[PDB]
Each structure stands twice: as structure tokens, then as C-alpha cells.
Design a binder for these strands. Structure first.
Ligand SMILES: CC(=O)O[C@H]1[C@H](C)[C@H](O)[C@H](C)[C@@H](O)[C@@H]([C@H](C)OC(=O)C(C)(C)CC(=O)O)CC/C=C(/C)C(=O)Nc2cc(O)c3c4c(c(C)c(O)c3c2O)O[C@](C)(O/C=C/[C@H](O[C@H]2C[C@@H]3OCO[C@@H]3[C@@H](C)O2)[C@H]1C)C4=O
Lengths: 1112, 85, 113
DNA sequence: TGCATCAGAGCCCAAAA
DNA sequence: TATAATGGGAGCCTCTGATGCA
């Protein structure tokens, strides 16, 4: 079909590689493909250079590292619950400074996880994403002192964990104080340690009249730099003997040591630029020629005084400005943990270079890599920034990799965050999306990288702009940081152009984010596109300019939750980004070079290239994602087809011919329906199920271990005590359910026996067994069964024993069986649907086709959406989307309407007119005239001012069709709806929240160990939590016995809950409750605290709630 | 050092197994199997015995270990009670 | 008033600080057992140092270590550094922590279930 | 005696994991 | 059961009330 694209904006550059923030960060960090001599000092390399050489006369030096090849490919790691990783080795030379002896060896440091092609990791078999972390850039900032006006605080901030923060203040007493680790002292003392004299300080700061005297302290000047260093050490470190070598070591490590104190590389540049100096390194001072030599402090002190006096050119810094906030990407975070483990490894090395043999030592004997392996293993498994990959659909993972978190180690906590950080800063323009953020507690903490944004080497987000010189728009694009952007006047991307020339007398531009009207002579740059302001998810919302931001937010976020549908289609109204998302996602498969297709299968595609070489592409079929949606690729080409470089070969999941397909295009009527549409609920036609729209495949993994016990081995067997052949029917000889079997709740998946607890033969069971004459078996039935509410078709079984090639399990485990069960899920009542504009609702009613509202020519609608959802939400894009969708339904076409440069109303009306000709002119030739009911509707419509009175019925119907309204017949009555109704094609997705997953109920079940209260959650067969607020509700109702049940018979009252069950199965009423067991726990816990808790009667005599059991 | 106390001599064997396995991993460029450790340990050691030794050496984990979410759930809360009926 | 000083320290019933075998045959245990273990070890060492007539420096270090150990058991983190399990930053959960807070005994299991 | 400073006390629910 | 060895090592919000200060 035709695809008609609107908009006049020509984008000079395409979107960058969308996962480059991940892929490029880690590639730069490992530098695996660089030959060692050519590596720059960055990532792991920089870490090695930092840790080495490791001194005492033994000295160990670092030569170079190398990364091997992965022991197992990616697919294999996922299968075997392995980390996809490479062996890391380091060439080290041991030197004896006394002897000269040199032993050199390459020591094995363990493995490092490798990133896959799409920017994710495989850690213990599961796919994970490392989320970038936003934080305050290192540097020197000046903020106003909130308590005392006209005063300022100078804050020197290094990288997290790479040094202390310093605060410079001018105290009310007049002396300038320095704050380090919460202690204050006169800054003059520290200045004296650097070798400063009254002359130098007088000439430097003298310019500021009254302030320099606060620096002057006679007593401090009396002591020489040596005396001042010992004095300061005694101020900062009470008790510790102030040995001169000891003091230098401490202060050196605190200030001048590049190993213990690291400003960023971004920290260094920001300091150099702010104070107008050049730093020789990343430390606040140096140790040179035996003494301390200042670097930062005097320039920082100079700027602070100049600001307090109000000298022009000294400013406070906006700390939420995106010039002072930078991103720590995968490479930086991992390298940080690498550096920690490396420092720990050095402790072991130095400790081993004393207690060992001074003669026989290799580098292999000296180095223990366990600390290093643990730091990396800790980061990847347990870090907060290492997250279980979101792969519900391909857009999910692309979005996850492009996410920015302000949380995690070294960042904000969630309760400790006020408005300022969560705000949308003016500098977010083009860098962080203003729309895509969580609606809940995390709003503003979790954000998304903008579509055209890229992170530079220093970690600042940059966005592209086109240069405009004289008035001509060049094609040269400049990526700017927020700080540099503030210098220029930047015109909007839609400003009219004839050729490359600006065609308007007054243009809309920004100066430091402030919008201003300006002459073309004043225009320095221009936006690349509208797209650059928003995230990838937001850019997928057509007519976004017509949607209130609060609803666009939900629209963005919910596309992440879209389930891959077996019939999935791309939307009839696209934004033009839907091809790029699939291609960068790597879900879909494309041709490497030009060639001809040799073979096409469900499982594989063979392509013959220009070289003559025959390349085979295997296809991923029905694989289970982290969230249990089916990822499967389908071949879109045929044998003998000539393909070009980059032509589509196979469609990934949730893609249609290479376009992102998150849902279906359905025919919707906007109208109330008998209250089944009420309060965002949705009414749908049974026709959707009939043609398998909104049907999705889901796979669940079940697992069971057979292990060695002290009571004897668990065995996975088909021989299970007391089971009929009916119960075992679908189990094979070995006890595993057969592939292709249908399993329902209660069915056995894997048969397993466990040796009976050592108490086991109860005397009651002994007599019972004796009566029937069946020996009580030694083992009990522990078989894995289908949980309540689950089940499907068995598509896979994996069995792994001990002692079979290639497999070694965790200690004690004989064998592991995994069963993959698939289900085809038809849309049903309670499943959740949404569109891209933030309209979301649960399916409340499925009507038979004869009840569905229908057009005069007999076509029934698919979905009925209530109009009451539009006006309060103010998301009108869905309305425009429906109108253009109506034209396309009859014209047989789809559209690309870009965001903010889109199809406008007049253009949509033209298409609607051409459509009416097809919807109506066809009929007039077929020998049918206007309907009687169409006449009644036209009458009511002319009473509403929709149609012009006096025109023919055909003319009036067309007037309504240009308004997107049609005559609609109620399938129940046959009578029309008394008014014309908005009908068109809408793109609607079936989201990840499905009633099948959430429906849960419990009579009785598992209880917790200490509290004896029911466990939580559906997976444990838990009970619902009746919490503090629920009790209040029962209290306010005065329902004392209902509440008492919740607190006793229905929870941790053991005698009570036991007695209640027996009563109910006997038809008796439930008995009076007893003491809740968790109160007894409370009493004993208070006794453990040496508090005597006594229950008393009205006579103040003790009442024993333990019934004699705890008293002698 | 252990919540479950181990005889001093048995701790010596466990530590020997660690040193041995760590050496083996440093020459082999990967973690050794149970069988490779049994060779390195000399006579008397087969793969089964290396596994049994590792099982005894496992330290318990806290019931108070946090479970995802936020600071909202404990590991012990997900453990059913099999003793009380 | 002298009851505010402890001579005999109570020991909570074992099932309220359980040692249980989980699914894999692995053991999971309450933090209180480690807090008690620290206490017992230091107390026994104190008995031994006393019987062997150690200098006052040794006895004082031991006694102050003993107070801190009781402190960790009853309210950990209240005074001084919170006692943690090795290779974890997680403070061990003491009796005070069990009683109080959103996750404590009163609000979690008593005013709601 | 009237003012400052610091230690310690709190910071939504249910759901999930 | 014996060469001699002798002092550690690290860090990221508001209200209310007691405590220590002119
Ligand atoms: C076990 C696990 O993977 O869960 C992970 C991970 C979020 C998810 O699973 C999954 C990738 C999920 O993102 C998608 C999925 C569809 O989920 C959802 O739809 C819901 C609605 C449920 C999301 C929700 O409501 O939570 C949806 C994403 C959509 C949006 C708008 C989003 O941005 N959400 C989101 C939600 C969060 O809360 C955090 C978060 C955090 C950091 C640094 C983040 O950036 C977070 C984040 O971005 O610090 C905190 C205190 O704790 C962090 C706890 C957990 O991290 C593990 C990481 C390691 O795993 C084992 O040890 C480690 C330990 C640290 O816990 C979280 C981070 C924390 O709250």
C-alpha cells in the first residue's frame, strides 16, 4: 500500500547509533581490539597505570594486559546459565631493587564480562543492562550561602569516592574557614603549609579590601611551613602521634596524591576553565622538591573573595545546569569497580611481599586476583545500576539502554531528593527528554537520553545544531554542551527557509534557553529537528504537538509494555522513526552486502553475496524473553530474490516488514456504550478474537533439582508413590513430561521422589498401611507440578545430570530439569490496552459482532472508546489520529506524519474528501440511495450546526465525513445513533498487564517461619496483606468480629485457624479465637531485651498465655 | 569465623582445596572442574570427594538479606514453615 | 535501679531466630545468632583471661569489647559503628530493629497481618 | 538566666521480588 | 614451640529536644 509522508522539514543528519551510549562506552573501556602499545590511558588501562608500580626492596610493575576470546558463545552462555566473558591476563615484571633480579610473568586475573552487539550483558545466564548514572560533575562551584546574604560557599567536589569535599566560607567572625570531613579551621593554616608568605597573600588578595584581613593571623604566620604542617595534622587528627613523616603521608594522600585524590578529567577542565588557570594534574596540590606546592586553593580563594566583594565576572553556578551534571556510562561505572578491586589486590600483593621468601617469588605467587574478581562480580550481579534487561518487546531494550538514572551507588536516595533535581532544567533541551519519566515516586530521577543526544568523552550530554552565518543555513552540524550553547542565539527548527536562506522577517530563537524574537541577522545556529528535543519513545507518538504532556508521558512509557502479537502490524499513522528503531534494535535481520537469496526456511535463510561466498543466517524461533514474551523472527524473503546491502531478510518480534509493530490497527467508534466503557474501560468486538488480533505467545520456565541429601538421593523418576497411570500418562520413561503435551494446573511436569523425613512412619500411618497391606514406601512424591492458574503446551525440556559431558552442577545437585511451557493468549476481559497518546483501559466487555455498532454498508467497528476520556485528559492527538485513520481505511493507505511537522487539518480534510468518494460514490453506482435513518441523523445533525441546511443528503453526509463523523447503526435495535459518531482507525497495543497473571486467591496455605502469618505474593500462594489502613477501615465500620477474624482465625492464631477449618468442613460455625502467635513472639522478644511483660486479669493476677509451656 | 563451626583440621583441608583450585585456575585460564582438583590434591582424592568437601564448606545466608524492591522485604519472608502443620 | 545493668543476658528461643534448611539443602539463619555468637566468644575469652591473670590492659580491652557486644545484640548501631557480617555493609538486625519501624514487629505483624 | 548546636527521630499503600 | 620482628586505617532532609555556653 501507499505510504504518504507529510512535513517540509529536511533533517540534515540521521539519528545517531541509538545504543552508542552503551557500545561505545564499553568498547573504549576495554580497548580489547587495540594492540597494547596503542592503547590510550583510559578505562582498565588507566586503572592499571594507577595501581602500579606497587613499591616495597621488592617492586612489582605493570607491563600490559590482554583479553582472550570468550570460552563460550553468547547463545551458549544463556543456555548454561554462564556469564559471557573473556579471560583477563596481565604481564607483570617483579624487580628486586637490591639484587637487580627480574622475574617476569603473565598472571591470570580472572574473567571480565563482554557486552553483546546490542549493548547488553549476559550475567549468570540472564540478560542485563547497565544504566547510565547522572550526577554532579567534579569541579569547583560557588553557591550563595542561604543563611547570610552577600556571602558565598566555595565547594570543591571530586569524583565520587576519589576524595573529600571542601567548603570555603567566610565566617561571621571574619576568618575564612575550610571544611573537610565536617571539621572547620582557619584556612590560613592550610595556606601556610603550601609555603605561602604574608607578602604573597597580601599582594594577591589585597585588591579586596576588608576580606584579606580575615586571612591574616599572626599566630599562624609565626610557625614555619614545617611547624604549620604538624600543627594542622594535630587539628585534623586528634591522638594519632603527629610524626613528621606521618603527617606528610596523611595530608599528601588527602590533597596531592593522584592515587587517593582524583578530580575527573572533566573535573580538571572545569576547574581550569572556571578559575582561569591550568592544572598540572588531577590533584589539589603537589609534592615537589620535598615540600608542598599549591595548585587549586589560591585560585579558588581568589575567586571566592572577588565574588563576596561583588567584583564583576564572578558568578554563582547553577548546579542543575547540564554543564555541571554529567553521565557516568557503562565503561566508567565498571572501570570504577575494576579500580576498587585493583586497589584491594594491591593490599594482598604488598602484604605478600613481606611474609614470603625474599628469594623465590614470581608474579604468580605474589598476586591474588580474588579481590579483583569479586569487585567485578559484585558490580554485575548486585549493583543497582545493573538491571534485569527489559525485553518485553524490542523497543523495551532500546529504551532501557538509553535510560539515565540519578539513583544508585554514589547518587541520590529516593526520600532525600527535593524538587530541584527532579525538575526539567532549561538545559535539558535537546539532551534529556522532558516527557519520558516515571509517573510514580521516581518522577524526575529516571529520565531518557534524547534522540539526537550523544555523550562526549568528558561525560556531558551534547545536542546538534546547524550553523547559520549571515542568514544561510549550512549543512555543518556542531555538537554543543549546555555551557557552550548558552553563548549563542539558536533559531527554531521550523523557521521558514527558501533554499538555505532564512525567509522570515522575525524568527523564533533561544538565548540561554529564553525564547526571543530576533532578526535573521542575529541568528547564529538552528535546531537540527523537533525530534532532538524528545526521547525515542516520545518521538513515536504522532500528533504529539496536540497532546498534553501528562498524557504523552503515559503514552511513551506504555509502548515499552507492548506485547509482541502474532499478527502485529505497524500503526497506520507513523512518525517516521519506526523503521530506525527496529534496525538499531537488532531484533530484525538485514543483508550484509548485495546478493541473491539462496534458501528460505522457517529456521534459516541462505544468501549468496558478491564475493561468491555463501553466508547462512539462522533465525531465532520462539525464544523466551526475560518477561516471558515470545521473541521470534520470521523470514520475509523468498528463494531467488535479489537483495541489496541492508535489505530486510527476517522480521523480528513486534515488527512488520521492518517497521515497529507494537499493536494492531483497529476500527474504533468514540461513543458511550451502556456503561461498559465507563471510567476508561473498553468494549471490544468478538471479531478481534476470531481473526486472532491481540493474540500473543507466552512461555514460562519451570525448574527442578534432584540433589544428594543426608537422608539419601532425590531421584527424578516416573515411579511416584500412589499415582494412577492417568496421572503419569504424559510422562516419559525417565519421568519428564513429553514435548507437545498439554499441561493444566495440578499436572506433573517432572516426577521426583524424596526420602521421607527421619520421623516419617507415624504410628497412625503404620496401622493404616497395615490394614490395606501396602508397605509404606521409603520415598515421598516431591514432583514438580503446574501451579494454580498456569499451564499450556510443553515446547521444550532440558535435562542435565552429573557425570555427563560438558556439565558440572553446583555442589550436591545430581540433576536439573527445565520445562518450557507455552501458551497462546487470546485477548480477554481484564487485559489492558493502550494507545500512544496515554489512553489506557482494561477490556470490560466482548460483544458478539451483531451487537457492535456498524456503518450503513454493514462493517462493524472493532473497539468502542468512551469520549469522556478525552476532555479531562486533553490528549487530542488520538482524535486527529482517528480522523486520518478513517481516510486511510477507505483509501487503503498509511501515513508518516512527523512530530511538530505533521499533517495539518486542511491536508487531513482533503484525504477525507477523497475517502468519502470511495465510501459513498461506490454506493450510488451500486443502485442504493440515502437511507431513512441517515435522514433522521442528518436532521439531528443539522439541529447541531454540523451540516449546512438545504444541501442534499449526499452533500451533508460529506460535510460530516470531513469532520470525521459517520452515521452509525446500533446492531441491537437497527435504529441509528441519534447523532453522527467519530469513527476511524486507531493504533492500540495490548500491554503486559494481563488478568491471567494477576488473578489469585487463597483459602489456607504456607505460613512464615517466625510470625506464622500467611506468606505473600501469588507465587507462594500467599494471602493478601490486611495492613494498618485496612484495620482502620474495619474499625471505622465498627466491625469488631470481622476485624478479630483477620487478626486471629485468618492469620497467625494457630489453634484458632486449625479449629476454624475443621469447623467449616463439619458445617459448624467458627469457634471463638485464641492468642495470636505473633503476640507471643513479641512477648519473648521483649524478654530477650530484659523487659518483663505480664498479662493480668482484673485482679492484677498473672494470666499465662503460654499455658504452662515456658515456666518451670 | 563460621556460624556453623567446623573442626580446625577440616578447615585446613578446605583452605588447601581453595589454594589448590586457585593455583589450578591460574595455570588453566578458567575455573577447574571437580576432577582437576582431585588430581592436584594427590592420592585419596577423586571428583566426588572434592564436591563433598565443598558442600560442607558452604556458609549460611542471612534470613534478613534484602530482596529487591527497596528496603521493603526480607529473604526469610519467602520461606514456608514445614514443621507446624 | 541496678536492674538497668545486666548480669545474666537472656537468650531468645531458637525458633524465633531460626536455622532452617532452604530448598537447596542450604542453610538460612537469623542475624541474632551471629550477634549472640560474638557475645559468647568474647565472654568466654574474658573468663579465660581472668583465670590466667592477664594485665589490666588486656582485661580492659576485653571488658569494653564485651559491653559493645551486648550493645550490638540489644540495639545495634545505637552507639558506635554498626556490627556487620563479613564482606557486607549490611548492619546486622538486632532486637531493637526487629521491634521498631515500618518493618518492625508492631507495624508489620501486629497492627496488620 | 536566654541562645546555639547536635544527636536522634521520622519520612504512603497495596502489588512484585 | 626459638634470627628478629613491638601504635589501625578510612568518608557524600526536617523537627524536636537536651546539652553545653555568654
Ligand atoms: C531485579 C531487577 O532487575 O529489578 C531492577 C529493574 C528496575 C527492573 O527489574 C526492570 C529492568 C525494569 O526497569 C523494567 C520492568 C518492566 O519493571 C517494571 O516495569 C516496574 C514497573 C516493576 C519497575 C518498578 O516499578 O520498579 C521497567 C523500567 C521502567 C522505568 C520507567 C524505570 O525507570 N524503573 C526504575 C525503577 C526503580 O525502582 C529503580 C531503582 C534504582 C535505580 C538505580 C533505577 O535505575 C531504577 C529504575 O530505573 O535503585 C532502586 C532503589 O533499587 C533498584 C532495584 C532493582 O535493581 C536490582 C539490580 C540488581 O539486581 C540484583 O541486585 C541488584 C539490586 C540492586 O536490585 C531494579 C533496578 C530503585 O528503586
Amino acid at each position: 500500500m501507499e505510504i504518504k509522508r507529510f512535513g517540509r522539514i529536511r533533517e540534515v543528519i540521521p539519528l545517531p547509533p541509538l545504543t552508542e551510549i552503551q557500545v561505545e562506552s564499553y568498547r573504549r573501556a576495554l580497548q580489547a581490539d587495540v594492540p597494547p602499545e596503542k592503547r590510550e590511558n583510559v578505562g582498565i588501562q588507566a586503572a592499571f597505570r594507577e595501581t602500579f608500580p606497587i613499591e616495597e626492596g621488592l617492586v612489582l610493575d605493570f607491563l600490559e594486559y590482554r583479553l582472550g576470546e570468550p570460552p563460550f558463545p553468547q547463545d551458549e552462555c544463556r543456555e548454561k546459565d554462564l556469564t559471557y566473558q573473556a579471560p583477563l591476563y596481565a604481564r607483570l615484571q617483579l624487580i628486586h631493587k637490591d639484587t637487580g633480579l627480574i622475574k617476569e610473568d603473565e598472571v591470570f586475573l580472572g574473567h571480565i564480562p563482554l557486552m553483546t552487539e546490542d549493548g547488553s550483558f549476559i550475567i549468570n545466564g540472564a540478560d542485563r543492562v547497565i544504566v547510565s548514572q547522572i550526577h554532579r560533575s567534579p569541579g569547583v562551584y560557588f553557591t550563595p550561602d542561604p543563611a547570610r546574604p552577600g556571602r558565598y560557599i566555595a565547594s570543591i567536589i571530586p569524583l565520587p569516592k576519589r576524595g573529600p569535599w571542601i567548603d570555603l566560607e567566610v565566617e561571621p567572625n571574619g576568618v575564612v574557614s575550610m571544611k573537610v570531613n565536617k571539621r572547620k579551621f582557619p584556612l590560613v593554616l592550610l595556606l601556610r603549609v603550601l609555603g605561602y608568605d604574608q607578602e604573597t597573600l597580601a599582594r594577591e588578595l589585597g585588591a579586596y579590601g576588608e576580606l584579606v584581613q580575615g586571612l591574616m593571623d599572626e599566630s599562624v604566620f609565626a610557625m614555619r611551613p614545617e611547624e604549620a604542617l604538624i600543627r594542622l595534622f594535630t587539628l585534623l587528627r586528634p591522638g594519632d602521634p603527629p610524626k613528621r613523616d606521618k603527617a606528610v603521608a596523611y595530608v599528601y594522600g588527602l590533597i596531592a596524591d593522584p592515587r587517593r585524590y582524583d578530580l575527573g578529567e572533566a573535573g580538571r577542565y572545569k576547574a581550569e576553565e572556571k578559575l582561569g588557570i591550568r592544572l598540572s594534574g588531577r590533584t589539589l596540590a603537589r609534592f615537589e622538591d620535598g615540600e608542598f606546592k599549591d595548585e587549586v586553593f589560591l585560585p579558588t580563594l581568589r575567586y571566592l573573595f572577588a565574588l563576596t566583594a561583588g567584583v564583576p565576572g564572578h558568578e554563582v553556578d547553577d548546579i542543575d545546569h547540564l554543564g555541571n551534571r554529567r553521565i557516568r556510562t557503562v565503561g566508567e561505572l565498571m572501570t570504577d569497580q575494576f579500580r576498587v578491586g585493583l586497589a584491594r589486590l594491591a593490599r594482598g600483593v604488598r602484604e605478600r611481599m613481606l611474609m614470603g621468601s625474599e628469594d623465590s617469588l614470581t608474579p604468580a605467587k605474589l598476586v591474588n586476583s580474588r579481590p579483583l574478581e569479586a569487585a567485578i562480580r559484585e558490580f554485575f550481579s548486585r549493583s543497582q545500576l545493573s538491571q534485569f534487561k527489559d525485553e518485553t518487546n524490542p523497543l523495551s531494550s532500546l529504551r532501557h539502554k538509553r535510560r539515565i538514572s540519578a539513583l544508585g551507588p554514589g547518587g541520590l536516595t529516593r526520600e532525600r531528593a527535593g524538587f530541584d533535581v527532579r525538575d526539567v532544567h532549561r538545559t535539558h533541551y535537546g539532551r534529556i527528554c522532558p516527557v519520558e519519566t516515571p509517573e510514580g515516586a521516581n518522577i524526575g530521577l529516571i529520565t531518557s537520553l534524547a534522540a539526537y543526544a550523544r555523550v562526549d568523552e568528558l561525560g556531558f550530554i551534547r545536542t546538534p545544531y546547524r550553523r547559520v552565518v549571515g542568514g544561510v543555513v549550512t549543512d555543518e552540524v556542531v555538537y554543543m554542551t549546555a555551557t557552550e550553547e548558552d553563548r549563542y542565539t539558536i533559531a527554531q527548527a521550523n523557521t521558514p527557509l527558501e533554499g538555505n536562506r532564512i525567509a522570515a522577517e522575525r524568527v523564533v530563537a533561544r538565548r540561554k534557553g529564553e525564547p526571543v524574537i530576533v532578526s535573521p541577522e542575529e541568528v547564529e545556529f538552528m535546531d537540527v529537528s523537533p525530534k532532538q528535543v524528545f526521547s525515542v519513545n516520545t518521538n513515536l507518538i504522532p500528533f504529539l504537538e496536540h497532546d498534553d504532556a501528562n498524557r504523552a508521558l503515559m503514552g511513551s512509557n506504555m509502548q515499552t509494555q507492548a506485547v509482541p502479537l502474532i499478527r502485529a502490524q505497524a500503526p497506520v499513522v507513523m512518525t517516521g522513526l519506526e523503521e530506525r528503531v527496529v534496525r538499531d534494535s537488532l531484533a530484525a535481520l538485514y543483508a550484509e552486502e548485495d546478493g541473491e537469496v539462496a534458501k528460505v526456511d522457517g529456521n534459516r535463510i541462505v544468501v549468496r553475496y558478491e564475493d561468491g561466498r555463501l553466508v547462512e543466517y539462522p533465525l531465532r524461533r520462539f525464544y523466551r524473553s526475560n518477561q516471558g514474551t515470545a521473541l521470534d523472527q520470521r523470514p520475509r524473503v523468498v528463494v531467488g530474490q535479489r537483495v541489496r546491502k541492508g535489505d530486510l531478510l527476517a522480521d523480528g518480534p513486534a515488527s512488520e516488514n521492518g517497521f515497529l509493530a507494537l499493536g494492531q490497527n483497529v476500527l474504533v467508534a468514540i461513543m458511550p456504550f451502556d456503561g461498559y466503557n465507563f471510567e476508561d474501560a473498553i468494549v471490544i468486538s468478538e471479531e478481534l478474537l476470531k481473526r486472532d488480533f491481540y493474540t500473543s505467545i507466552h512461555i514460562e520456565r519451570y525448574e527442578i533439582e534432584a540433589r544428594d541429601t543426608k537422608l539419601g538421593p532425590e531421584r527424578i523418576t516416573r515411579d511416584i508413590p500412589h499415582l494412577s497411570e492417568a496421572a503419569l500418562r504424559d510422562l516419559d520413561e525417565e519421568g519428564v513430561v513429553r514435548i507437545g503435551a498439554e499441561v493444566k494446573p495440578g499436572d506433573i511436569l517432572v516426577g521426583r521422589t524424596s526420602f521421607k523425613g527421619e520421623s516419617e512412619p507415624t504410628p497412625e500411618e503404620r496401622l493404616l498401611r497395615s490394614i490395606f497391606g501396602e508397605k509404606a514406601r521409603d520415598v515421598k512424591d516431591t514432583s514438580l507440578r503446574v501451579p494454580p492458574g498456569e499451564g499450556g503446551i510443553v515446547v521444550r525440556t532440558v535435562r542435565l545430570r552429573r557425570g555427563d559431558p560438558g556439565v558440572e552442577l553446583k555442589p550436591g545437585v545430581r540433576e536439573v530439569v527445565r520445562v518450557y511451557v507455552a501458551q497462546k493468549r487470546k485477548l480477554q476481559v481484564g487485559d489492558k490496552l493502550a494507545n500512544r497518546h496515554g489512553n489506557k483501559g482494561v477490556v470490560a466487555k466482548i460483544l458478539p459482532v451483531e451487537d457492535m455498532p456498524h456503518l450503513p454498508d454493514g462493517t462493524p467497528v472493532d473497539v468502542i472508546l468512551n469520549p469522556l476520556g478525552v476532555p479531562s485528559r486533553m490528549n487530542l492527538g488520538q482524535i486527529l489520529e482517528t480522523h486520518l485513520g478513517l481516510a486511510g481505511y477507505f483509501l487503503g493507505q498509511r501515513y508518516i506524519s512527523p512530530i511538530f511537522d505533521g499533517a495539518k487539518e486542511p491536508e487531513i480534510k482533503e484525504l477525507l474528501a477523497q475517502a468519502f468518494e470511495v465510501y459513498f460514490g461506490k454506493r450510488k453506482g451500486e443502485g442504493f440511495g440515502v437511507d431513512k435513518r441517515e435522514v433522521e441523523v442528518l436532521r439531528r445533525a443539522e439541529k447541531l450546526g454540523l451540516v449546512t441546511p438545504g444541501k442534499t443528503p449526499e452533500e451533508q453526509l460529506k460535510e460530516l465525513f470531513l469532520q470525521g463523523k459517520v452515521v452509525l447503526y446500533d446492531g441491537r435495535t437497527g435504529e441509528p445513533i441519534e447523532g453522527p459518531i467519530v469513527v476511524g482507525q486507531m493504533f492500540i497495543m495490548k500491554l503486559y498487564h494481563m488478568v491471567e497473571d494477576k488473578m489469585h486467591a487463597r483459602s489456607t496455605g504456607p505460613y512464615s517461619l517466625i510470625t506464622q502469618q500467611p506468606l505473600g505474593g501469588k507465587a507462594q500462594f500467599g494471602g493478601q496483606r490486611f495492613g494498618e489502613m485496612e484495620v482502620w477501615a474495619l474499625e471505622a465500620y465498627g466491625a469488631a468480629h470481622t476485624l478479630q477474624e483477620m487478626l486471629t482465625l485468618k492469620s497467625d492464631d494457630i489453634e484458632g485457624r486449625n479449629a476454624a477449618y475443621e469447623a467449616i468442613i463439619k458445617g459448624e460455625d467458627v469457634p471463638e479465637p485464641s492468642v495470636p502467635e505473633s503476640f507471643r513472639v513479641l512477648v519473648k522478644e521483649l524478654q530477650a531485651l530484659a523487659l518483663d511483660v505480664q498479662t493480668l486479669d482484673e485482679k492484677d493476677n498473672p494470666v499465662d498465655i503460654f499455658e504452662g509451656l515456658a515456666s518451670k | 569465623a563460621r556460624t556453623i563451626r567446623i573442626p580446625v583440621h577440616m578447615v585446613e583441608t578446605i583452605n588447601k582445596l581453595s589454594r589448590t583450585a586457585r593455583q589450578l585456575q591460574q595455570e588453566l585460564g578458567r575455573e577447574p572442574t571437580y576432577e582437576e582438583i582431585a588430581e592436584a590434591m594427590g592420592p585419596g582424592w577423586d571428583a566426588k570427594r572434592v564436591e563433598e568437601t565443598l558442600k560442607i564448606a558452604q556458609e549460611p545466608v542471612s534470613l534478613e538479606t534484602p530482596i529487591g524492591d527497596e528496603k521493603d522485604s526480607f529473604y526469610g519472608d519467602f520461606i514456608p514453615d514445614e514443621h507446624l502443620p | 535501679p541496678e536492674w538497668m545493668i545486666l548480669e545474666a543476658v537472656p537468650v531468645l528461643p531458637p525458633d524465633l531466630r531460626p536455622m532452617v534448611q532452604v530448598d537447596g539443602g542450604r542453610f538460612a539463619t537469623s542475624d541474632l545468632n551471629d550477634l549472640y555468637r560474638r557475645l559468647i566468644n568474647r565472654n568466654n575469652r574474658l573468663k579465660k583471661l581472668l583465670a590466667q591473670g592477664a594485665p589490666e590492659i588486656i582485661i580492659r580491652n576485653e571488658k569494653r569489647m564485651l559491653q559493645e557486644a551486648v550493645d550490638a545484640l540489644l540495639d545495634n548501631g545505637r552507639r558506635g559503628a554498626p556490627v556487620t557480617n563479613p564482606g557486607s555493609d549490611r548492619p546486622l538486625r538486632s532486637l531493637t530493629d526487629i521491634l521498631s519501624g515500618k518493618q518492625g514487629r508492631f507495624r508489620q505483624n501486629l497492627l496488620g497481618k
